[PDB]
Ligand SMILES: CC(=O)N[C@H]1[C@H](O[C@@H]2[C@@H](O)[C@H](O)O[C@H](CO)[C@@H]2O)O[C@H](CO)[C@@H](O[C@@H]2O[C@H](CO)[C@H](O)[C@H](O)[C@H]2O)[C@@H]1O[C@@H]1O[C@@H](C)[C@@H](O)[C@@H](O)[C@@H]1O
Ligand SMILES: [Ca+2]
Ligand SMILES: [Ca+2]
């Protein structure tokens with residue numbers, strides 16, 4: 001028994017995969033579902049620190065499963081859970097600024113940034129480690 005499928009990274013009971021191509025927010029969600037996963041929904045500060053490193057390391061702008069599409073200002077993860085105040089510190093300073101309507105969150109630099117959902121970016125999928 002191995003926790004994750006080949007090519008997927010194991011971290012604290014969960015499996016992660018970062019794309020090698022760029023897609024918009026909605027397409028990234030579909031990309032993850034197609035591999036039995038979900039555009040990464042962060043559940044803890046530790047997980048955030050882990051994921052942020054992968055983006056700041058490779059110096060890549062990456063999608064996460066978070067948006068305020070349904071209600072401007074109200075950020076919600078793709079699984080329905082609301083963005084806890086515990087995570088506000090992660091937005092880069094000045095973010096989220098919603099310029100030109102930015103309703104999708106990405107890992108950008110050392111923190112998060114809200115950007116155009118239709119912009120193509122890399123994405124990270126997450127799914128629980130095998131039983
Ligand atoms: C207000 C705005 O549109 N911010 C842009 C910024 O735009 C300015 C204009 O406001 C000003 O009049 O002219 C200058 C050029 O002389 C400039 O166009 O332009 C920057 C650079 O393109 C842009 O930041 C970049 O945003 C992209 C988004 O994909 C990416 O994050 C990149 O790393 C940034 O450097 C500003 O965009 C906004 O601010 C960013 C900090 C971020 O919050 C973006 O989501 C915003 O759209
Ligand atoms: Ca917004
Ligand atoms: Ca922004």
Ligand SMILES: [Mg+2]
Pocket residue numbers: 068069072101103
């Ligand atoms: Mg909107």
